[PDB]
Design a protein around this ligand. Structure first.
Ligand code: OIN
Length: 121
């Protein structure tokens, strides 16, 4: 679920999902179009594609379970949708962590008109 993803993001990065990642660049928090602005935005692009691989799943609301094995995220078995959603979220949280070194506040609340063009998954 979105709330679980937000908790995972905070655990991983030390940043609150809202507002650090809810309106960032062209793909974080609201998706759509444009060339991703930087590595963090590319994490969101891929996360959006990942959810897009699951047409008949409901990532915003469906809850999954996971544990930590030392720092590692381990998705625990639930329904097939839950397992796949968890793997999408885990990857995005790791990606955000890997790209904190280039996170830029200038991309928070990024305006929609600066995001044009389709980028295929
Ligand atoms: C799980 N749902 C999909 C359709 C709305 C959502 C979120 C999707 O893509 C996103 O993760 C983005 C954030 O990057 C998002 C946009 C708008 C609302 C919630 C999430 C796929």
């Amino acid at each position: 679920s979105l709330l679980e993803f937000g908790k995972m993001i905070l655990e991983e990065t030390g940043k609150l999902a809202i507002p650090s990642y809810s309106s960032y660049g062209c793909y974080c928090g609201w998706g759509g179009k444009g060339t991703p602005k930087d590595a963090t935005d590319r994490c969101c692009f891929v996360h959006d594609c990942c959810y897009g691989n699951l047409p008949d799943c409901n990532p915003k609301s469906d809850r999954y379970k996971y544990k930590r094995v030392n720092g590692a995220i381990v998705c625990e078995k639930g329904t097939s949708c839950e397992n796949r959603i968890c793997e999408c979220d885990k990857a995005a949280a790791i990606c955000f962590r890997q790209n904190l070194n280039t996170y830029s506040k200038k991309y928070m609340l990024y305006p929609d008109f600066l995001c044009k063009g389709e980028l295929k998954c």
